[PDB]
Amino acid sequence: RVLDVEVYSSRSKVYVAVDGTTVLEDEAREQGRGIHVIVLNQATGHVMAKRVFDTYSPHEDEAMVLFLNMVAPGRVLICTVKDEGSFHLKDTAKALLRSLGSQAGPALGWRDTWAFVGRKGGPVFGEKHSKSPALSSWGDPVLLKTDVPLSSA
Template sequence: MRVSGVVRLLSLIFAMVATWIFFRSYMSFSMKTVRLPRWLGSAPKETRVVHTKCSNSKPCPANFFAFKIFSGAANVVGPTLCFEDLVIMSPVKNNVGRGLNIALVNGSTGTMLRHSSFDMYSGDPQPLVKFLKEIPAGALVLVASYDDPGTKMNDELRKLFSDLGSSYAKQLGFRDSWVFLGAQDIKNKSPFEQFLKNNPDTNKYEGWPELLELEGCVPRKTL
C-alpha cells in the first residue's frame, strides 16, 4: 500500500475515533445538564396541606369531635376555646373574661349550647354555681382559666367541677393555669385536663405560670 493510502486510512480512523469521543462526551454532558427531572419526572411533588379541625396535630376518627383549648397567658392574652373547627371563645371574638371561661356543647350533635365567663377574683361565685347546676344531660363542658381562676373557688364549686370529671378542681388556687374538658353524667375522671400551680420559683411569666394547650378527640355521645 502506498504511503498516501496509509495516511488517508489513518486520517479516516482518527476522524472516526474523534467523532465517537466527541459524541460520547456530548451525550454525557447533555444527560447531566438537561436531565428529564426538570421537565418530567423529578419535579417536586405537590405538597398537600391536610386541614385538621381546630388546627389540631392530627385529624379525629369518625364519630369523634375535635377540640382545642388554650388557657390565658398571665393577665395579658385571653384564652381560646375551639370545638369542631368553630372558635367559640377567644380574644379576637372579644367574649372572654378574667377567671373561668366556659362553653357548653351538645355531646351528640356538637352544637354549641351556651358560653360565659366568670370573674373568680372579685366576682360573685353564685352565678357560676347556677350555671354548672343547669348544665343539661349529655353536654360537654370546655373550661379555660385566665388571670385568676381560684380566689372565689369554694367547696361547692370544687365538687361540681369534680362531678364533671375534673381531677384538679379541688386544688385550684390563685393564678393557677387550668384547661379542662368534662361532661355531665361522666362515669370516670376525664382524660382531658391540664393544670399548673402558681409557683414563683417555676412561673414562666412574672406572677403567673405559662399558658396551657389541650387538644384531642372526644367521642360523640350516642343516644
C-alpha cells in the same frame, strides 16, 4: 363520630376551637378574667351556652354553681381560665368541680392556668393544669387537645 377540641388557658388569652374552628377567643387586655365555660351539644357539637365567671371576684362562683347545676347530663363541658380564677372559688364550687371528675379544678390556686373537657355525668376527656410558681407570676400557658366522642341519633 368525634369532635377535635382545642382549649387554651393563659394569663392574657383564652380560646377554644372545635373541629378546627374558633368558637371562643378572648385576647383583650383587661377583660374576660376568670373561668370561661362552654357547653356543647353531645351529638352535633353545637354551642349551647358560653359564659364567663370572674371567680377572682366575690359571688361569681355562686352564679357558676347555679349555671352548672342546670346543664343537662351528657352535655360536653369545656372550662378554661384567663388570668385568675381561684381567689373567690369557694368550697361549694370546688366540690361541684370534683363531682364532675376534675382533679385540678378543686385544687385551683392563685394565677394557675387550667383547661378541662368533660361530659356532665362523666367521664373527663382531658385536663391540664399549670401551677403558678410565685405570687407575682402566672402558671405556664396550657394547650389541651383532645378528641370527644359524639353520641349518635
